[PDB]
């Protein structure tokens, strides 16, 4: 290393390139990259020098490569590269470089952005977005694959979110990228969209306006779960918006897709499928009817009764939200009770958290109010007692939280 360092600080350029390559190789060792002994050599600012304009492009390439891997280490190691002011030069290389240098520069920026929200935002206020978006006019798959990964890191992270006015500029590009034949490009593109769609209704509308949702629904049937997971997440984020925005996803045919996803070998996919459905049944009566027509209730009921708890929660939300459509259209409740939803709802009261208990109690009251209305014109109350639920609801009066008590109290007093 001491000879490599001296060789690097030469002014012989042959030698500078020779030393940089040697530094690159050791930082590219297949196991245990000696990043900190390289940092301790104090060669990082020198490597950044090799990336400036007017350097031989082979030297820029090898330097950017070495700095890329140093930045791929711990946060402290990434900090050394950032504090050496390498980021503005990385971005400069996105203009002046070749496809090989540009892929290297965007790779480095990906590691910097992928460190923390601070460095993510830092890359963005260094005005990196515009030259980055310009890269996607390339005919190089690997350049676009790497740039998409970097782009996803820029859209990633909450507390705080990235500057929306900046990252939203990527939406037309991301809209095209989800039509890619390259799987790795496809995956990171969907993750980026899932991040961007995770926000206010203004953010969701932006995703809708660039006509992303329909392609997302298509990608739900992709063979790889690596594609399905961020796609389902993005779709699930969109339907957290208002009824109009949700209807866009419905018109895109998400309901038959979600039925397929309910039988996924991945538990987390089944959970987020339930979660997506629940935010659709949270909409108007017509949208609840659409869920029912799509034959989604029977697998939801079974998941409510057998699945893992984290999945049960979302299935509960779906059935409970659907029951709210019961006051306006009582046949919704009749169908829900007919599909045996009462007992799995009741059984949940003894194990669930206070929020789900509250969700469950609202479902049970809706069923009761309807069953009560189907009297002046209680079956459901009888079904609930036989379900062992009357006991469970009574026990909820022993809950420390007031809104659950008040709720359970009125339910018991009104219908029992």
């Amino acid at each position: 290393l001491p000879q490599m360092t001296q060789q690097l600080n030469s002014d012989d350029m042959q030698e500078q390139l020779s030393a940089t390559v040697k530094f690159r190789q050791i930082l590219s060792r297949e196991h245990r990259p000696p990043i900190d002994v390289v940092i301790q050599a104090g060669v990082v600012p020198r490597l950044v020098e090799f990336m400036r304009e007017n350097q031989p492009e082979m030297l820029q390439l090898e330097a950017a490569w070495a700095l890329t891997n140093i930045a791929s280490g711990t946060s402290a190691q990434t900090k050394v590269v950032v504090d050496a002011d390498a980021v503005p030069l990385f971005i400069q290389l996105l203009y002046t470089g070749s496809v090989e240098v540009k892929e290297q520069a965007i790779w480095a920026l990906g590691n910097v952005a992928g460190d923390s929200t601070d460095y993510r935002d830092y890359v963005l206020q260094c005005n990196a977005m515009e030259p980055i978006l310009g890269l996607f006019n390339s005919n190089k798959p690997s350049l676009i694959r790497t740039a998409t990964w970097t782009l996803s890191n820029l859209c990633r992270g909450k507390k705080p979110q990235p500057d929306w006015s900046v990252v939203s500029q990527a939406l037309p590009t991301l809209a095209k990228l989800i039509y890619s034949m390259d799987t790795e490009t496809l995956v990171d593109a969907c993750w980026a969209i899932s991040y961007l769609s995770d926000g206010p209704q203004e953010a969701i509308q932006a995703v809708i306006d660039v006509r992303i949702p329909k392609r997302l629904v298509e990608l739900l049937s992709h063979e790889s779960t690596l594609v399905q997971t961020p796609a389902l997440r993005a779709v699930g984020n969109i339907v957290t918006g208002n009824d109009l925005q949700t209807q866009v996803v419905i018109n895109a045919g998400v309901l038959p897709a979600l039925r397929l996803l309910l039988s996924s070998p991945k538990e987390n996919i089944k959970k987020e499928a339930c979660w997506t459905i629940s935010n659709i049944t949270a909409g108007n009566t017509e949208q609840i009817q659409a869920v029912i027509d799509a034959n989604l209730i029977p697998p939801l009921v079974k998941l409510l009764e057998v699945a893992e708890y984290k999945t049960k929660k979302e299935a509960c939300w779906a059935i409970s939200n659907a029951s709210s459509g019961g006051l306006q259209r009582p046949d919704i409740i009749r169908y829900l009770v007919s599909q045996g939803c009462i007992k799995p709802l009741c059984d949940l009261l003894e194990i669930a958290d206070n929020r789900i208990i509250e969700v469950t109690l609202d479902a049970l009251e809706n069923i009761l109010k309807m069953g009560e209305a189907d009297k002046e014109a209680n079956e459901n109350a009888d079904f609930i007692e036989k379900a062992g639920g009357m006991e469970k609801i009574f026990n909820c009066q022993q809950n420390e939280n007031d809104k659950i008590y008040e709720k359970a109290y009125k339910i018991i007093e009104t219908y029992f």
Partner: peptide
């Protein structure tokens, strides 16, 4: 009403090997 079912910043880095 709608709902979301954790703000964790795992490092997302790739070394060139």
């Amino acid at each position: 009403r709608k709902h979301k079912f954790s703000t964790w910043a795992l490092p997302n880095k790739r070394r060139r090997i």
